[PDB]
Nucleic acid binder design. Structure first.
Lengths: 78, 95, 90, 104, 92, 96, 78, 95
DNA sequence: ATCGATGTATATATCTGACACGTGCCTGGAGACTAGGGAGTAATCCCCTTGGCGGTTAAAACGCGGGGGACAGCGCGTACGTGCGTTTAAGCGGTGCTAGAGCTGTCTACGACCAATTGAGCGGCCTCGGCACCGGGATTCTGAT
DNA sequence: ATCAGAATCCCGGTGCCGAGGCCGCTCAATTGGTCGTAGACAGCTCTAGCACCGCTTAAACGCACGTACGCGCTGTCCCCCGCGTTTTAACCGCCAAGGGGATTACTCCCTAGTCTCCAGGCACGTGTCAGATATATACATCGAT
C-alpha cells in the first residue's frame, strides 16, 4: 500500500515545499522516509494505546506520540 | 512555467495533499506489524492527525532538501539531498 | 474543561470585531496547555534544583525568562509583575 | 459572607487563577504551590494568548476575513520572530506552510 | 553526605569485567548517565500516569516508559531484565 | 535488603526514595523501583561492557571517558539513546 | 576580546571535525557562532544563578542551562 | 600531507583545543552583559564545562558543514556551508 | 514584441452550516478558620575564587612562495515537465451491525504513614600499581628520481 | 620499482598521584502494623468505527516529445597550506586576601486542609450571517502565434 502514496502526491508535497524540479528517484525515497516516519509514530501510538486497556488508537495517542518525538501537533488534543 | 503557478497555488491552500484512503490503508499496514498480528481500530481524527504530521514533516524535509539542492548548484532534487538533510537534522529530527 | 471562554474574552478585548473558528479555538486551547506544561515543568525543576518545595512567583518568573525569547521575556514578566502586584493589594 | 470576587478579577486578568491553581496543584509539579504563582502564570498565559491573537486578527484582516482560521494562526506564528522561536517545534493542523518561493 | 551511584556502577563493572576499573571522571560520566536515564524514564512514566488519570507509578508505567524511550533491541532486553527482577522480587 | 531480593546490584530503596521525593506521581508502587533499578542496571551493564571492551582494545586496564565515547558512538542503539549528550573529555570517533 | 579565539584554534577545531581545507572567511564566522552559543548558554546560566541567591556561576548552572537547551553534558554535574 | 596527520592526531586526543584563558576572558566578557553590570564569579569547573560544551558544539558543526561542503563538490569549507548547517540544523539545535 | 488572447482580482448571488448568544444546571472555586512546617533572615566558618608576580616556553603571528582548487565557460545527452487520451480508485451518500470506549458501583489488595533499629554507604586516609613520559631498537612509510 | 630520510610502535626504566581498599560512624532503608482509598473488575449503555453497495468523476497514469539542465572537461587565477623565523601571551608555580557559598538556629507567615455555599463555566439548543462557490465584468500581463 506504500505505492498508494502516488507520484502526484509526492510531487504536490514537494511543490508545497518550494521544489522546482524533482528527479524520478525521489518517489522511491520519499516512500521510504514516510515508512520510517510512520513506523516511528505508530510504534509510540500503539505503545500508548496498549498501555491503556484499549484496542482503539485514539487521536490523543497520536498527539502524545508526536510530543514524545519532540514535534508537537496542535489541534487535536484540546 | 506551470511550476510557478503550481507552487504559488499549493503554498496558499491548507488541504491535505496525500489522499486520505491510501494513507489510511498505509497506516493500517504499518500498525498491524507492531501489534503482533492483531488488528487495532483507529479513530477518525487519529488518521487525520497522523496525516497532518506526516505531510508537514514531508514538506519541511522537502524545503530543507531543496536548500541542499540549491547549495549543490542545481535545481532538481536528488535523493542524496534528502539523505543528507536527514543526517544534518540529526538522529530524531531528520529520522 | 477547556480555555475557550478565556481565549474568546481575550480575543474580544484585543480585536473587538473579529471572531475565531472552532479549529482555531482548538489550536488556542492546545497552545495555552502546551505553554502551561512547559512553564510549569521548568518551574518544577527550578524548585527541585534548589531543594525547595514551593513554586512561588519567583520560580514562574525565572521559568518565563528561561523559556521565552528575549523580547517576550521582558514583556511577560512585566505583565506578571504587574498582575501579582495588583493581586496582593486585594 | 462577603460577595465572591474571583481571583482573576482582582488581578485584572481574563485567564482563570483558580483553575490554573488547581492545575498547578494537581499537576505534580511540586508538593506545594504558592499564592502568587497562579496569578503570575495566568498573566503570562493571557499575555501570550493576546500576543498571538493580535497577529492572528491582523492576518485575518489582511485576508479580508472577519473570522480566524488556523491558517491565520500559522501566518501569525511564522511571521513574528519571537513566536517562531517559541513555537519552532510546533505543527499547526490544517495550516499551510508560509509562502517562501526563494528567488534562486 | 552527598549520595551518588558510584558504588553500584563499580559493582556492575566488576561483574561484567572483573579486571578493569574506572577513573574518577568516567565514574562521573556513569553517575550522571544513570541520573539522566532515571530522570527520563521516571518523567515519561509520570506524564504517562497523568494521561491515563492514574495516580500510581506501577510497573506498567515503568515498562511502557522503557518501551517508549529505548530503541528496539535495548527495549526488548531491558523489559526482560525488568520483568525478571519483578518476578524474582515478588516470588520472595 | 530489598535490592538483594530482586537479584540486582542497583539499589531499590534509593530508587524508591527518588521516585517518591521526585514529585513524579502521588503514589509509587512496589515493583516500580524494582523494574526501574533493573533497567538502570542493565543499561549500565551494557555501556560498561562496551566501554571495557573499548578500553581493552586500547590495551588499558582502566576506563577513561574516551572509552565511554568509543562505546556509545560505535554502538548503533546507544548512539540513539545518547545522541543529544556530550561526554566530557571524550574525543570524536575517528572518521574522514 | 573574541580575537583570543585564535586562527590556529579554529583550525584545530575544524581539523578535529575532519575539515581538510578551511577558507579565510571561516574564522570571522566561527567567532560569531561561538559568540551566539555562549550568549545563549551564559544567559541561561546567569538566569539559573540569579534565581538562587548567588553571585557565582557554578558548574551546575552551566550543566542545567545546557540540559535546558537540549544538549546534555555529562561528567561535571550529577 | 600534513592535514591528514593533523586530523588523525587531533581525533586521537581529547584535550581542549581552545586555550583556557582567552576563552575564560570571552566567557566573562559575555557574562558581564547579562548580570546587570555587577560582575559575577565563575567556578573552576564552570569554565571547563562551558569550554567542553562549546568545543563539542564547534566540532559537531564543523562535521555537518563539511558534509555540506563535500555535497557542493568542494573540499574547502566556506562560511555559506556553516550558515546552511545552522539553517537546516534548526532553530533549536543550531545557533 | 508596436497588440490580442489569457489568467486574475471585484462583485453580486445564492446557500449551507458553523459560530455565537441564550438558558439550565452542577461542580469547582471562593470565603473563613486552623495549624504546622518551609522558607526568610541573621550570624559565622571556612572554602575557593580572584588577583598578583615572575619566569619559561609552547604556541601564535608575519611573510613568502607555490601548487591545489574554486569557479566560470561550454558541449553532449539524459531525463523531467507538459500535454492529452484513457482508466481507475478515492470520495460521497446512505445503511446496518457490533466491537469497544466510557461510565457506574463494589470491594479488596496496596501503598502511604509512623516508630525502632541497624547495616549499607559516605567521608576520610593511606598505599601501590596503572599510566604518562622518556629512551633507544626495529621497522615502515614518503617525496624526489 | 629505488632511494635515503623522516615517521610510527615496542620493549624497558622512572616516577607521580589517583584509584581502590579499609575503617568509623550515622542516617536512611528495612521491618511490623494500620488504614484509608485508588484501581481491578464485573455489568451495562450507546457511540462511532468498520464494512458494504452503488454511482460519480476528479485524479492518477501511460505515452510521447521538446528542451532545460546535470555533468564531465578545461583554463585562468586566487588564495590556503607549509615553512621558517620572531614574539608574545598562556601557563605553571607561589602566595595572600577576602567575598561569598554553605551550614545552623530561630521564627513567622504562608499554604495545605476542611467545610460551606453559590456563581462561573459547561452541555445543549437554536437563529443568522460569514464564507465557499458561481459566474459574468473589468483589469493587468505577458508569451505564441
Amino acid at each position: 500500500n506504500i505505492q498508494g502514496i502516488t507520484k502526484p502526491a509526492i510531487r504536490r508535497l514537494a511543490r508545497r515545499g518550494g521544489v522546482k524540479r524533482i528527479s524520478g528517484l525521489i518517489y522511491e525515497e520519499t516512500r521510504g522516509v514516510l515508512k520510517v516516519f510512520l513506523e516511528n509514530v505508530i510504534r509510540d501510538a500503539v505503545t500508548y494505546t496498549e498501555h491503556a486497556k484499549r484496542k482503539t488508537v485514539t487521536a490523543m495517542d497520536v498527539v502524545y506520540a508526536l510530543k514524545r518525538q519532540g514535534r508537537t501537533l496542535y489541534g487535536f488534543g484540546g | 512555467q506551470g511550476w510557478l503557478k503550481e507552487i504559488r497555488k499549493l503554498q496558499k491552500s491548507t488541504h491535505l495533499l496525500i489522499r486520505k484512503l491510501p494513507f489510511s490503508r498505509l497506516a493500517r499496514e504499518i500498525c498491524v506489524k507492531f501489534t503482533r498480528g492483531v488488528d487495532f481500530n483507529w479513530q477518525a481524527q487519529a488518521l487525520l492527525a497522523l496525516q497532518e504530521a506526516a505531510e508537514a514533516f514531508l514538506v519541511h524535509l522537502f524545503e530543507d532538501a531543496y536548500l541542499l539542492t540549491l547549495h549543490a548548484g542545481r535545481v532538481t532534487l536528488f535523493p542524496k539531498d534528502v539523505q543528507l538533510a536527514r543526517r544534518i537534522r540529526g538522529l530524531e529530527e531528520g529520522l | 474543561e477547556s480555555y475557550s471562554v478565556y481565549v474568546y474574552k481575550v480575543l474580544k478585548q484585543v480585536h473587538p470585531d473579529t471572531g475565531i473558528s472552532s479549529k482555531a479555538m482548538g489550536i488556542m486551547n492546545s497552545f495555552v496547555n502546551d505553554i502551561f506544561e512547559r512553564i510549569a515543568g521548568e518551574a518544577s525543576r527550578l524548585a527541585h534544583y534548589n531543594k525547595r518545595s514551593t513554586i512561588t512567583s519567583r520560580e514562574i518568573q525565572t521559568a518565563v525568562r528561561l523559556l521565552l525569547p528575549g523580547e517576550l521575556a521582558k514583556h511577560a514578566v512585566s505583565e506578571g509583575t504587574k498582575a501579582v502586584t495588583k493581586y496582593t493589594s486585594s | 459572607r462577603a460577595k465572591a470576587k474571583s481571583r482573576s478579577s482582582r488581578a485584572g486578568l481574563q485567564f482563570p487563577v483558580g483553575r490554573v491553581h488547581r492545575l498547578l496543584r494537581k499537576g505534580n509539579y511540586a508538593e506545594r504551590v504558592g499564592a502568587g504563582a497562579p496569578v503570575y502564570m495566568a498573566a503570562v498565559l493571557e499575555y501570550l494568548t493576546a500576543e498571538i491573537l493580535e497577529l492572528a486578527g491582523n492576518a485575518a484582516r489582511d485576508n479580508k476575513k472577519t473570522r480566524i482560521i488556523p491558517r491565520h494562526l500559522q501566518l501569525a506564528i511564522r511571521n513574528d520572530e519571537e513566536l517562531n522561536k517559541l513555537l519552532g517545534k510546533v505543527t499547526i493542523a490544517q495550516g499551510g506552510v508560509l509562502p517562501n518561493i526563494q528567488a534562486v
